[PDB]
Design a protein around this ligand. Structure first.
Ligand SMILES: [Mg+2]
Ligand SMILES: [Mg+2]
Ligand SMILES: [Mg+2]
Ligand SMILES: [Mg+2]
Ligand SMILES: [Mg+2]
Ligand SMILES: [Mg+2]
Ligand SMILES: [Mg+2]
Ligand SMILES: [Mg+2]
Ligand SMILES: [Mg+2]
Ligand SMILES: [Mg+2]
Ligand SMILES: [Mg+2]
Ligand SMILES: [Mg+2]
Length: 70
RNA sequence: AGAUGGUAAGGGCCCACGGUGGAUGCCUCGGCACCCGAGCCGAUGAAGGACGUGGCUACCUGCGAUAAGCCAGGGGG
């Protein structure tokens, strides 16, 4: 995923409430599973999308953790 | 009547060239000694591990279900 898009994901991410974050993760986590399935049947040529989503879920959770910790 | 050479089944010594084998010289990502710097870690769960972790991954390295990585500051180009 693009550098600029990362920064953009973070800005909008840091504006969410934990619940919105929790909900957002669950969907991107669901999208990861959808990706894995098509990856299974050789129907995902844009395979970089898998690594990409994994780190989004990472970046979200990191921020979810940010929200809670002080 | 007498006498003396060509035979090499195979073998021996020398010479040429190969095979095998990995000495020798050169080489060094490693080691060895001395000197200096530096010296604790852990229930806020250590040292050391197990099992996992990649779109395709046997192993090593890294990492821990956020899993060859996540956030921020500094360095760099
Ligand atoms: Mg990043
Ligand atoms: Mg004769
Ligand atoms: Mg002969
Ligand atoms: Mg013969
Ligand atoms: Mg002889
Ligand atoms: Mg020879
Ligand atoms: Mg020499
Ligand atoms: Mg000393
Ligand atoms: Mg020490
Ligand atoms: Mg350990
Ligand atoms: Mg688990
Ligand atoms: Mg920087």
């Amino acid at each position: 995923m693009k550098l600029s898009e990362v920064r953009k994901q973070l800005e909008e991410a840091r504006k969410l409430s934990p619940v919105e974050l929790e909900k957002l993760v669950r969907e991107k986590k669901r999208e990861l599973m959808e990706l894995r399935f098509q990856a299974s049947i050789g129907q995902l040529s844009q395979n970089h999308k898998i690594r990409d989503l994994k780190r989004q879920i990472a970046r979200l959770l990191t921020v979810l953790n940010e929200k809670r910790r002080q």
